[PDB]
Amino acid sequence: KDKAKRVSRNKSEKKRRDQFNVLIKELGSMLPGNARKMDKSTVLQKSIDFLRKHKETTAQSDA
Amino acid sequence: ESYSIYVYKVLKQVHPDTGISSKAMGIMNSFVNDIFERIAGEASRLAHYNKRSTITSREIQTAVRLLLPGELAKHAVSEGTKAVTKYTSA
Amino acid sequence: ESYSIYVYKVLKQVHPDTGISSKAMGIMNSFVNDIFERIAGEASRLAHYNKRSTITSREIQTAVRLLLPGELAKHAVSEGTKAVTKYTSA
Amino acid sequence: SSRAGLQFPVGRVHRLLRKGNYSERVGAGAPVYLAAVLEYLTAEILELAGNAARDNKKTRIIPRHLQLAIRNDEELNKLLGRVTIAQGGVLPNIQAVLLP
Amino acid sequence: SSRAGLQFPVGRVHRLLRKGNYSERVGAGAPVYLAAVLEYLTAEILELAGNAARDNKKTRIIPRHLQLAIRNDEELNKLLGRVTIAQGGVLPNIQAVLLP
Amino acid sequence: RDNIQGITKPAIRRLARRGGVKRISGLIYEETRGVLKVFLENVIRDAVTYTEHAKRKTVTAMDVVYALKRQGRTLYGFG
Amino acid sequence: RDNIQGITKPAIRRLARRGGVKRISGLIYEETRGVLKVFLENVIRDAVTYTEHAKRKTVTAMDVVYALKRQGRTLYGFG
Amino acid sequence: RIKNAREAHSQIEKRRRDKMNSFIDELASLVPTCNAMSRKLDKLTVLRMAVQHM
Amino acid sequence: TVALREIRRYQKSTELLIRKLPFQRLVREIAQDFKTDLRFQSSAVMALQEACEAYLVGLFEDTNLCAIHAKRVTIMPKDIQLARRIRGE
Amino acid sequence: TVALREIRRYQKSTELLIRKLPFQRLVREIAQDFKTDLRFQSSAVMALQEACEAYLVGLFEDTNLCAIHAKRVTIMPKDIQLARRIRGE
DNA sequence: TCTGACACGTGCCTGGAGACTAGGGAGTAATCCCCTTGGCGGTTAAAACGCGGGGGACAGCGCGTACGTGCGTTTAAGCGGTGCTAGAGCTGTCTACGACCAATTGAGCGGCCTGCAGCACGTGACCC
DNA sequence: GGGTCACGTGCTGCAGGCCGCTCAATTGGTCGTAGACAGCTCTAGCACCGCTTAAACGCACGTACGCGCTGTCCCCCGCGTTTTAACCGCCAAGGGGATTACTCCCTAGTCTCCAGGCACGTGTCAGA
């Protein structure tokens, strides 16, 4: 019967996964050159490249 | 023994959202020990100079005034004075 | 109380043909008190560090080694050791 | 402590005052007076150290913050002038004559 | 003092150690050891001071002689490096660069 | 008031000479007086504090000796 | 033997830079090593003396703290 | 035989996690706010800081 | 140009600029002159390292000031010696 | 030539180089700042004077050395300031 | 011949010395655990070495002012003498607080367990 | 069959709660000393007055030192390349320190007694 309690814990694990999924959509949509159908790894990869580019550009403007 | 409990409580009262490292805490404990020795030593010397066998708030107050710089001396004395008056009353 | 009697006697035993002025003697008395405090202070601290309630010749001998320079310490320590040896032997 | 209104202990302070051969006798006010003083000084340092932490976006105090907090305060700097702080670092002071 | 072969008082040293808040207890041999040390150090100064008096054709020691004896002797000079001596005067030190 | 001026230029010259000084700029006299005044003020404040603690009206030699001693300067001959 | 050479010229330069030194003569390195050697000897000798008095064979941070403390130098964080 | 397909699947799934985790650490390093952290940030926090930073 | 950058860099950071291993050996090298076959706690050595750098840095600061007083840029042993003598060494 | 003879004379002698009444008034001038209507022992005041002169002599010696380091004979406040700073004043 | 210091003589009290007893502290012994010390292998960064150029330091020359030195005039400090009070020092008396000892109670800390949250892993579903 | 996403399970860590133990705080009682208060006396310090000598202050003149300017050479600084040590990670053994228990000795406290030490006065000697 106590196995039912695990469902709440399963929901908690799902909540963490869902928070990640929501942030992936926001993270991808907040980038320039937006594209659909990017997978989670691709969204992160393009986010990494964007931030490197953004850092490079602001650094390029100085010194 | 340590003051980590009391230091943390004071830190929370001043900075409710700020934590403290173990290294910083060790430093604060050394600080407190240092201050104690300075005052206790001077209070004893004052009693010696004045041929007294006991320590009272007067010896502590004078030791505080001698040891601390202008602003700290004034404020530390005020805190000591109230605590004794308040404790004595209660 | 003063050490003028003992200081004078020692001088006579070293230099029989000279004496000590009043000002010079006041200085020598100030000196003796200063040296006593320095050694006794360190001996007390050694007892404190090692959580001991008794001061013995060991704490004093160590205090002498810590306070005095090499050559002077060797001679001062030798005299202290001999005095105890002679005393306990006599 | 409770009646004194202090966070810091008094009973151990009383113990420490009578211990160590400071005096033959200790008055009731002395442990209390001192406990208030120790708490006061502690609070002042913690306040400044916390500020140093905030200036660097930290929520946690480290030895570097304690060093900065003290040396920037002339009363504390004098009081602790002979004190070395582990991992405290140094102030970034450069003489003007050395600059181009 | 006679038993120890000392000129300095043993009882007085014991009393000072016993009643100076240095510790709860004092060992019987401690006063003897210390009295010998104090006597030795005193003798070192007196020997030099007596020589200083002689070098000035004096038969009596004055504060200046103590100053001369102390500051010429390195071990004593370090020991009394921060001591001020009444009517001690100063040593006649002049820098060569100032001379013609 | 103004007893620091009581230390005349000749007084400074004598002291400077005792310290082995051969030649003196005109600004030394004022700098020296400023420093001396501050030095003395610190010593007296401690001596007076001792007198006040004892609730005395008269400052004694021991108040001075204790003041100098706690400052690091041990004095022989005055107790 | 010869562990003082283990502190290399670049190490000396880094220390001098922390001290705000812009330009360093070639004689500094030897002078600096001599100065440090004296400092270490003084602190260690006292720390060892404390250890010996306690009849111990292992030197602890407190022996160092006592050695420094009596030399007018205290250290927070190490005890 | 076909049992290997499930074993391969669990290894593929871990490889996907490892690739994402590697990117999360790299992404965190590019956000200045992460410099204030001593401990490694959790997956959700790093993504949140990246969008907050942008 | 580089020296100013180095000063800023080293003043900003908190880590030791000396090497730890030769320091540990040096402590024994010296300590053995007082007593042989000694054992040491690592915390004792670390305490020494912090004190040693702080000591030398303070001397460097005074040395630099002495050179500046003489209107010079470089530091020399003569500047160190003046600072040391004034400080009682 | 005159300065060297004066140095030798003042180093040779032991008397106070400051007039007493000006000194006594200065002490009372200061002491009144802390508390009014004070009384002073003469020996206490003389103890202060001896310490004060000893202090200045030490200051002058270091000041002179600083001027010498700078390859100068004349002492300036600049030299005093360096010596005082090095000694922590 | 006089003044100050040293030596000699006299008187009184305190401290030191000697004697005795008990408890607590110090010293000694045995056992156990952790840290330090010692050794081996690999990788990366630091240190060491070499080369070229510029700036800094040192040396030399010239000029002017401030400082140093001497003389004369004016003033204060120092020395000696006179007068009075408050504070300091000493003695005696009385009380409250602290110390010492015993007895209780409450809160907090430390350790252990439980619950919740987080991280990693495996399986199923969906898409190609 | 491969890759991604979604769902559930297993294990670990942190926070909260509970249990057990200790200390401090609290409460109560007794005894003595030290501190506080009161009274009395004397000295040193403070205040005031007068005179003389030396020092300080003011004025004038000249020199040396310090400052400013110019020129030359060497060392240090900066960069690049090569070699070694430092640093990092992993593994093993022994000794010292730490912890616990037991025994013995010394000092402090208490008690008793005397001389020397300390202070004061006189006489002689050395220096003035």
Author numbering:
A (entry chain M): 31 to 93
B (entry chain D), C (entry chain H): 35 to 124
D (entry chain C), E (entry chain G): 18 to 117
F (entry chain B), G (entry chain F): 23 to 101
H (entry chain N): 76 to 129
I (entry chain E), J (entry chain A): 45 to 133
What is the paper's account of this structure, in its own sentences?
The basic helix–loop–helix (bHLH) family of transcription factors recognizes DNA motifs known as E-boxes (CANNTG) and includes 108 members. We focused on two structurally and evolutionarily distinct bHLH members from the bHLH-LZ and bHLH-PAS clades, represented by the proliferation regulator MYC-MAX and the circadian TF CLOCK-BMAL1, respectively. Structural studies with engineered or native nucleosome sequences show that MYC-MAX or CLOCK-BMAL1 triggers the release of DNA from histones to gain access.
To dissect the molecular basis of CLOCK-BMAL1 binding throughout the nucleosome, we determined cryo-electron microscopy (cryo-EM) structures of CLOCK-BMAL1 bound to a solvent-exposed motif at SHL+5.8 (CLOCK-BMAL1-NCPSHL+5.8) with an overall resolution of 3.6 Å, and at a histone-facing E-box at SHL−6.2 (CLOCK-BMAL1-NCPSHL−6.2) at 3.8 Å. The CLOCK-BMAL1 structure at SHL−6.2 wedges the entire bHLH fold between the DNA duplex and histones H2A and H3, juxtaposing the bHLH loop of BMAL1 to histone H2A L2. Readout of this histone-facing E-box required a larger amplitude of DNA release (up to 33°), with the BMAL1 bHLH domain (for example, BMAL1 Arg114) substituting for some of the nucleosomal DNA–histone contacts (for example, H2A Arg77). At SHL+5.8 versus SHL−6.2, the CLOCK-BMAL1 bHLH domains differ in orientation (around 90°) relative to one another. In contrast to the SHL+5.8 structure, histone interactions now involve both CLOCK and BMAL1 through a more extensive (around 1,700 Å2) interface with histones H2B and H3. This model, supported by rigid-body docking and XL-MS, highlights electrostatic interactions between BMAL1 residues Gln385 and histone H4 Glu52. Moreover, a conserved arginine (Arg173) within the BMAL1 PAS-A domain is positioned adjacent to the negatively charged H2A Asp72 and the dipole of the H2A α2-helix. Mutation of BMAL1 Arg173 and Gln385 to alanine, accordingly, resulted in diminished nucleosome binding in lanthanide chelate excite time-resolved fluorescence resonance energy transfer (LANCE TR-FRET) experiments (hereafter, TR-FRET), while not affecting free DNA binding. CLOCK-BMAL1 at the histone-facing E-box (SHL−6.2) differs from the solvent-facing E-box (SHL+5.8) in the extent of DNA release and the detailed histone contacts. The CLOCK and BMAL1 PAS-A/B domains cover the H2A–H2B acidic patch at SHL−6.2 more extensively than observed at SHL+5.8.
